[PDB]
Short mmCIF file of C-alpha atoms in Angstrom, two decimals:
data_model
loop_
_atom_site.label_atom_id
_atom_site.label_comp_id
_atom_site.label_asym_id
_atom_site.label_seq_id
_atom_site.Cartn_x
_atom_site.Cartn_y
_atom_site.Cartn_z
CA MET Q 28 -133.84 104.17 -10.61
CA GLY Q 29 -136.06 101.20 -11.46
CA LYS Q 30 -136.50 97.52 -10.53
CA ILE Q 31 -135.33 96.73 -14.08
CA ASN Q 32 -133.26 98.66 -16.62
CA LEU Q 33 -134.46 97.48 -20.00
CA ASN Q 34 -131.27 98.76 -21.66
CA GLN Q 35 -129.32 95.95 -19.93
CA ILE Q 36 -131.34 93.02 -21.16
CA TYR Q 37 -129.96 90.58 -23.74
CA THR Q 38 -130.62 87.21 -25.25
CA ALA Q 39 -128.21 84.37 -24.37
CA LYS Q 40 -126.50 84.79 -27.79
CA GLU Q 41 -125.99 88.52 -27.25
CA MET Q 42 -124.80 88.12 -23.66
CA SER Q 43 -122.39 85.37 -24.97
CA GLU Q 44 -120.78 87.95 -27.25
CA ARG Q 45 -120.73 90.50 -24.49
CA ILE Q 46 -118.51 88.21 -22.40
CA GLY Q 47 -116.27 87.60 -25.42
CA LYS Q 48 -117.34 84.06 -26.23
CA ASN Q 49 -118.82 82.28 -29.26
CA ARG Q 50 -122.51 83.26 -29.57
CA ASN Q 51 -123.62 79.81 -28.50
CA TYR Q 52 -121.67 79.66 -25.23
CA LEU Q 53 -124.42 80.45 -22.75
CA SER Q 54 -127.12 78.50 -24.63
CA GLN Q 55 -124.83 75.47 -24.55
CA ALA Q 56 -124.05 76.02 -20.83
CA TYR Q 57 -127.80 76.07 -20.18
CA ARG Q 58 -128.62 73.01 -22.34
CA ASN Q 59 -125.74 71.07 -20.75
CA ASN Q 60 -126.49 72.05 -17.14
CA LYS Q 61 -123.07 73.72 -16.66
CA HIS Q 62 -124.10 75.28 -13.36
CA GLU Q 63 -120.59 76.20 -12.35
CA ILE Q 64 -120.73 78.67 -15.23
CA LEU Q 65 -124.40 79.61 -15.05
CA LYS Q 66 -124.22 80.50 -11.40
CA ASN Q 67 -122.21 83.65 -12.18
CA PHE Q 68 -124.98 85.22 -14.31
CA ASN Q 69 -128.25 87.01 -13.79
CA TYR Q 70 -130.58 85.17 -16.10
CA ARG Q 71 -134.13 83.79 -16.29
CA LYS Q 72 -136.24 81.65 -18.58
CA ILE Q 73 -138.93 84.09 -19.96
CA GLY Q 74 -141.18 82.15 -22.32
CA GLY Q 75 -138.91 80.50 -24.95
CA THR Q 76 -136.03 82.99 -24.50
CA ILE Q 77 -133.32 82.71 -21.77
CA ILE Q 78 -132.79 86.33 -20.95
CA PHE Q 79 -129.63 87.69 -19.32
CA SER Q 80 -128.45 90.95 -17.77
CA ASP Q 81 -124.94 92.12 -16.98
CA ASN Q 82 -126.36 94.00 -13.90
CA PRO Q 83 -127.09 91.69 -10.91
CA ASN Q 84 -129.53 94.26 -9.58
CA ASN Q 85 -131.89 93.94 -12.55
CA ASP Q 86 -134.95 92.02 -11.37
CA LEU Q 87 -135.65 89.84 -14.38
CA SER Q 88 -138.81 88.46 -12.70
CA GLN Q 89 -140.43 91.75 -13.66
CA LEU Q 90 -140.25 90.89 -17.40
CA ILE Q 91 -143.25 89.37 -19.08
CA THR Q 92 -143.82 88.53 -22.72
CA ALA Q 93 -146.17 90.80 -24.61
CA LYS Q 94 -148.14 87.60 -25.31
CA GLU Q 95 -148.66 86.95 -21.61
CA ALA Q 96 -149.54 90.65 -21.02
CA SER Q 97 -152.12 90.44 -23.86
CA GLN Q 98 -153.63 87.27 -22.34
CA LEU Q 99 -153.75 88.90 -18.87
CA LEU Q 100 -155.89 91.73 -20.35
CA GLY Q 101 -158.23 89.23 -21.98
CA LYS Q 102 -157.11 90.02 -25.49
CA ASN Q 103 -155.80 88.08 -28.53
CA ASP Q 104 -152.23 86.77 -28.16
CA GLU Q 105 -151.00 89.42 -30.66
CA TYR Q 106 -152.74 92.37 -28.96
CA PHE Q 107 -149.54 94.19 -27.77
CA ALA Q 108 -147.41 93.00 -30.71
CA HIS Q 109 -149.95 94.50 -33.18
CA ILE Q 110 -150.11 97.83 -31.32
CA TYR Q 111 -146.33 98.00 -31.03
CA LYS Q 112 -145.87 97.49 -34.81
CA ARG Q 113 -148.63 99.85 -36.09
CA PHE Q 114 -149.23 102.36 -33.26
CA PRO Q 115 -146.01 102.47 -31.27
CA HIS Q 116 -146.86 105.76 -29.60
CA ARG Q 117 -149.54 103.88 -27.66
CA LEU Q 118 -146.60 102.38 -25.69
CA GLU Q 119 -145.02 105.74 -24.84
CA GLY Q 120 -144.44 105.70 -21.15
CA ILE Q 121 -144.99 101.87 -21.06
CA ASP Q 122 -141.61 100.23 -20.38
CA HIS Q 123 -140.95 97.60 -23.08
CA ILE Q 124 -138.13 96.00 -24.98
CA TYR Q 125 -137.96 94.04 -28.26
CA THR Q 126 -135.12 91.55 -28.36
CA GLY Q 127 -134.70 88.01 -29.61
CA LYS Q 128 -137.55 88.70 -32.00
CA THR Q 129 -139.92 89.07 -29.02
CA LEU Q 130 -141.67 92.02 -27.40
CA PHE Q 131 -141.58 92.13 -23.58
CA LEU Q 132 -143.35 94.43 -21.06
CA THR Q 133 -142.89 94.58 -17.32
CA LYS Q 134 -145.40 93.72 -14.64
CA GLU Q 135 -145.40 97.39 -13.57
CA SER Q 136 -145.70 98.73 -17.16
CA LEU Q 137 -148.67 96.50 -17.77
CA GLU Q 138 -150.22 98.22 -14.73
CA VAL Q 139 -149.39 101.63 -16.12
CA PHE Q 140 -151.04 100.69 -19.39
CA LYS Q 141 -154.25 99.45 -17.70
CA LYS Q 142 -154.52 102.76 -15.80
CA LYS Q 143 -153.98 104.85 -18.90
CA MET Q 144 -156.88 102.70 -20.29
#
Protein backbone atom coordinates (compact mmCIF):
# COMPACT_ATOMS: atom_id res chain seq x y z
CA MET A 1 0.00 0.00 0.00
CA GLY A 2 2.91 2.36 0.62
CA LYS A 3 5.07 4.91 -1.24
CA ILE A 4 7.94 2.42 -0.82
CA ASN A 5 8.07 -1.33 -0.24
CA LEU A 6 11.26 -1.95 1.68
CA ASN A 7 11.20 -5.65 0.71
CA GLN A 8 12.04 -4.64 -2.90
CA ILE A 9 15.16 -2.65 -2.22
CA TYR A 10 18.61 -3.95 -3.19
CA THR A 11 22.17 -2.82 -3.60
CA ALA A 12 23.56 -2.61 -7.16
CA LYS A 13 25.41 -5.94 -6.61
CA GLU A 14 22.23 -7.69 -5.47
CA MET A 15 20.08 -6.21 -8.23
CA SER A 16 22.86 -7.31 -10.72
CA GLU A 17 22.34 -10.91 -9.60
CA ARG A 18 18.61 -10.52 -9.72
CA ILE A 19 18.80 -9.72 -13.45
CA GLY A 20 21.12 -12.70 -13.98
CA LYS A 21 24.37 -10.82 -14.49
CA ASN A 22 27.80 -10.77 -12.82
CA ARG A 23 27.49 -8.94 -9.47
CA ASN A 24 29.42 -5.97 -10.80
CA TYR A 25 27.25 -5.31 -13.86
CA LEU A 26 25.18 -2.38 -12.61
CA SER A 27 28.05 -0.78 -10.66
CA GLN A 28 30.12 -0.86 -13.84
CA ALA A 29 27.20 0.54 -15.90
CA TYR A 30 26.96 3.40 -13.41
CA ARG A 31 30.73 4.10 -13.24
CA ASN A 32 30.94 4.00 -17.06
CA ASN A 33 27.87 6.15 -17.74
CA LYS A 34 26.09 3.37 -19.70
CA HIS A 35 22.81 5.26 -19.74
CA GLU A 36 21.23 3.08 -22.38
CA ILE A 37 21.31 0.35 -19.74
CA LEU A 38 20.71 2.47 -16.65
CA LYS A 39 17.61 4.07 -18.08
CA ASN A 40 15.66 0.81 -17.70
CA PHE A 41 16.07 0.70 -13.89
CA ASN A 42 14.58 2.36 -10.85
CA TYR A 43 17.63 3.42 -8.91
CA ARG A 44 19.00 6.32 -6.85
CA LYS A 45 22.25 7.39 -5.24
CA ILE A 46 21.49 7.25 -1.43
CA GLY A 47 24.65 8.27 0.43
CA GLY A 48 27.48 6.00 -0.81
CA THR A 49 25.15 3.18 -1.96
CA ILE A 50 23.39 3.09 -5.39
CA ILE A 51 20.11 1.53 -4.44
CA PHE A 52 17.82 -0.26 -6.90
CA SER A 53 14.29 -1.65 -6.95
CA ASP A 54 12.68 -4.08 -9.36
CA ASN A 55 9.32 -2.21 -8.86
CA PRO A 56 9.11 1.09 -10.83
CA ASN A 57 6.46 2.30 -8.42
CA ASN A 58 8.81 2.30 -5.42
CA ASP A 59 9.64 5.93 -4.63
CA LEU A 60 13.31 5.65 -3.74
CA SER A 61 13.41 9.37 -2.84
CA GLN A 62 11.69 8.38 0.38
CA LEU A 63 14.80 6.48 1.59
CA ILE A 64 17.23 8.21 3.88
CA THR A 65 20.30 6.86 5.62
CA ALA A 66 20.00 6.28 9.34
CA LYS A 67 22.98 8.67 9.60
CA GLU A 68 21.04 11.47 7.93
CA ALA A 69 17.94 10.69 10.08
CA SER A 70 20.13 10.86 13.23
CA GLN A 71 21.59 14.22 12.11
CA LEU A 72 18.08 15.57 11.34
CA LEU A 73 17.08 14.83 14.98
CA GLY A 74 20.17 16.60 16.29
CA LYS A 75 21.83 13.44 17.49
CA ASN A 76 25.22 11.69 17.02
CA ASP A 77 25.73 10.13 13.58
CA GLU A 78 25.34 6.63 15.11
CA TYR A 79 22.11 7.41 17.01
CA PHE A 80 19.77 5.12 14.95
CA ALA A 81 22.48 2.54 14.18
CA HIS A 82 23.15 2.10 17.95
CA ILE A 83 19.44 1.75 18.78
CA TYR A 84 18.90 -0.68 15.93
CA LYS A 85 21.75 -2.96 17.12
CA ARG A 86 21.00 -2.95 20.90
CA PHE A 87 17.29 -2.07 21.21
CA PRO A 88 15.69 -3.11 17.94
CA HIS A 89 12.18 -3.09 19.36
CA ARG A 90 12.47 0.70 19.53
CA LEU A 91 12.10 0.58 15.71
CA GLU A 92 8.93 -1.54 15.74
CA GLY A 93 6.48 0.24 13.55
CA ILE A 94 9.32 2.44 12.08
CA ASP A 95 9.89 1.33 8.47
CA HIS A 96 13.60 0.53 8.01
CA ILE A 97 15.88 -1.72 6.04
CA TYR A 98 19.51 -2.83 6.52
CA THR A 99 21.26 -3.64 3.27
CA GLY A 100 24.71 -3.01 1.86
CA LYS A 101 25.94 -2.81 5.43
CA THR A 102 23.84 0.33 5.96
CA LEU A 103 20.67 1.08 7.90
CA PHE A 104 18.05 3.20 6.09
CA LEU A 105 14.77 4.78 7.32
CA THR A 106 12.16 6.58 5.29
CA LYS A 107 11.17 10.22 5.47
CA GLU A 108 7.72 9.14 6.72
CA SER A 109 9.12 6.63 9.27
CA LEU A 110 11.37 9.30 10.70
CA GLU A 111 8.16 11.31 11.24
CA VAL A 112 6.49 8.37 12.91
CA PHE A 113 9.46 8.00 15.22
CA LYS A 114 9.46 11.70 16.21
CA LYS A 115 5.75 11.46 17.10
CA LYS A 116 6.21 8.33 19.16
CA MET A 117 8.91 10.45 20.93
